């Protein structure tokens, strides 16, 4: 446990990702929580560049960036279940879509809240919805009719996309929209229960109402 420490604000999609990976590999670790109102001194010297979490500390060495940490964990604990696909092409697709999610989709969803007008807001929501259609199609190709983006087994892209599910539902609820439905995202609807119920996920997965009430705390 003391060999592996995870620095993280909570709740957070990015912090959730290494927690799931560690769970998949059955790795004991201590969770160091960053508390609201200040950056810890350990954070400031572990991640001096970005000053944010997650930071995995493995034998007093810091690894930053949530996806970089997931692949680090996959590689170091290579005995355990594979997190990334084994085929080079499948891995490239998995990395491609996680990058899309982090650089384009989630920033767009998070911008909804800051929209100035109802037109701007609607535009953003439409864009989040179109990204889901893209992700439904990616799920079809990646899953091959199995449970997960990773196939029969939870994988890297499940972790990247699933980490945001709680925030997707909160923003759906708070904006009064259904972005993920049976007509346009039937596979993702099913996968979202498979993911959130997964043994390596369910104890670190947030109640939607929790995140809604928490967004209201943050509003300061």
From TrEMBL:
Glutathione 1 binds at residue 66. It catalyses: RX + glutathione = an S-substituted glutathione + a halide anion + H(+). InterPro entries: Glutathione-S-Trfase_C-like, Glutathione-S-Trfase_C_sf, Glutathione_S-Trfase, Glutathione_S-Trfase_N, GST_C_Tau, Omega/Tau-like, Thioredoxin-like_sf. GO terms for biological process: glutathione metabolic process; toxin catabolic process. Its EC number is 2.5.1.18. Keywords: Cytoplasm, Detoxification, Transferase. Residues 2-81 form the GST N-terminal domain. GO terms for cellular component: cytosol. It is found in: Cytoplasm, Cytosol. Its main location: cytoplasm. It is an enzyme of class 2 (transferase). GO terms for molecular function: glutathione transferase activity. Glutathione 2 binds at residues 39, 53, 66. Signal peptide: none annotated. Residues 87-220 form the GST C-terminal domain. Belongs to the GST superfamily. Tau family. Is involved in the conjugation of reduced glutathione to a wide number of exogenous and endogenous hydrophobic electrophiles. PANTHER family: GLUTATHIONE S-TRANSFERASE U17, GLUTATHIONE S-TRANSFERASE, GST, SUPERFAMILY, GST DOMAIN CONTAINING. This is Glutathione S-transferase. It comes from Salix babylonica.
């Amino acid at each position: 446990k003391s060999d592996v420490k995870l620095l993280g604000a909570w709740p957070s999609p990015f912090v959730m990702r290494p927690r799931i990976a560690l769970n998949i590999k059955s790795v004991e670790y201590e969770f160091l929580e960053e508390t609201l109102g200040s950056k810890s001194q350990l954070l400031l010297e572990s991640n001096p560049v970005h000053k944010k979490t997650p930071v995995l500390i493995h034998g007093g060495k810091p690894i930053c960036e949530s996806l970089v940490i997931v692949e680090y964990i996959d590689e170091v604990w290579s005995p355990g279940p594979a997190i990334l696909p084994s085929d080079p092409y499948d891995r490239a697709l998995a990395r491609f879509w996680a990058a899309y999610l982090d650089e384009k989709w989630f920033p767009t969803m998070r911008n909804i809240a800051a929209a100035k007008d109802e037109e701007a807001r609607k535009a953003l929501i439409d864009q989040v919805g179109e990204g889901l259609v893209l992700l439904e199609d990616a799920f079809s190709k990646c899953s091959k009719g199995k449970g997960f983006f990773g196939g029969d087994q939870i994988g890297y892209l499940d972790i990247a996309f699933g980490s945001f599910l709680g925030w997707l539902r909160a923003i759906e609820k708070m904006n009064g929209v259904k972005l993920m439905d049976e007509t346009r995202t039937p596979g993702l609807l099913k996968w979202a229960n498979s993911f959130s119920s997964h043994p390596a996920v369910k104890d670190v997965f947030p109640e939607t109402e929790k995140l809604v009430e928490f967004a209201k705390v943050l509003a300061k």
